[PDB]
Amino acid sequence: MQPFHSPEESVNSQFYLPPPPGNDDPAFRYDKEAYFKGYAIKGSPRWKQAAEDADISVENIARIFSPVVGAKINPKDTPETWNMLQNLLKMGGYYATASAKKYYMRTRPFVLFNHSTCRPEDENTLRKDGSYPSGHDAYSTLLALVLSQARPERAQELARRGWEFGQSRVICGAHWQSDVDAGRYVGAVEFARLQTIPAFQKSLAKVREELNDKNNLLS
Amino acid sequence: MQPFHSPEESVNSQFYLPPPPGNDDPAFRYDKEAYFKGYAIKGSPRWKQAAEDADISVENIARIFSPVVGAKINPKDTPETWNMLQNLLKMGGYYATASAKKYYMRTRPFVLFNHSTCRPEDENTLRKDGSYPSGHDAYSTLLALVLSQARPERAQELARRGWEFGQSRVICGAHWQSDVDAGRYVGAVEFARLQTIPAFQKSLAKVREELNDKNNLLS
């Protein structure tokens, strides 16, 4: 599997995004209220939901989205969809966010307040990485849009799932609300950039075939 | 020109959007703070810029986006681009937001605080219409993405301009910050849905020609 494009062929997120809020901004006051709101329900089911949502491995991504698109997603039955899930992680999670991330190097909520997140295993990786904008949310957003393109029949369920991911990220404590909001817009910009890349069109054509194949449909 | 699709073929926004922030919500406290901050600069340059962004007439939209996409947009030199701008106002401004707007009928900020907006000539219409999600922002986002598909080398400028429109809407006082965020996402969801419609693809192919035509280029 070969990347749809290079880091330099992402749209420069540092150019189009506004800077992140300072501790004096009303948007930061919202950021921290939303953080403590999420932290207040530690241990609960919704919190456990958020730990499940928070894993960005392709296996987890597949298990979450499969019931949503209404088709099997696994390396055997849907090999191209499986590659597409991973290709879009690199494109949307890393390439699309990278220059704004590195520019601002925004400090994560859990580090600032000395708490643990809903997913302690990932914490040390996340410390080294600028919060803003959220690459996780750029990724889950791009994913929802591509899958909506391949399976328009399930667009409304895909868009709902795409929104809910953001609520999970805020609850898990590794992103601020404002990271999530900027991440969503980044995911749409990358989605638009992918439409003009022939390799992406070629792979989407096969994904559409896999997910609409009667043999792959659920239930 | 004829509509890319029917009202039924937009994704049901009532299904995938959350309810708007209510009386006690932190997001709502943020909505008010961002409203106050915007009215407090009544009369400034920024307020005059916002007044100009607020006009969604095709003539004004074309004037704004022209320098940004780097080509002339007018009925004579770019007839399909002209139709495309009108089609997307219907698709994105109206069809894509309709079920959520009707369902919630959210009161606008200027009404809740007994004020004027930055564009009083439009206040009569806007009064009739629910705030959430923002159709003006769904539209201006859809437009920015679609033009990015046509001239991908101007994608960073178009992405920036698309963000700035949102900031103008919050300042003008006809929409809450949370309407604007929800409208951006709606515009992306409609953008994905349009990718699946042949009439849109045919029309985009002509737009791409018009806008990269040497006779129409511009700086």
Automatic annotation (TrEMBL), chains A, B:
Reaction(s) the record says it catalyses: a phosphate monoester + H2O = an alcohol + phosphate
InterPro entries: Acid_Pase_classA_bac, Acid_Pase_classA_bac_CS, PAP2/HPO, PAP2/HPO_sf
Chief location: periplasm
Annotated keywords: Hydrolase, Periplasm, Signal
Disulphide bridges: C118-C172
Hydrolase listed as a keyword: yes
Class of this enzyme: hydrolase
Domain Phosphatidic acid phosphatase type 2/haloperoxidase: 83-195
The keyword Secreted is assigned to this record: no
EC nos: 3.1.3.2
The protein, known as: Acid phosphatase
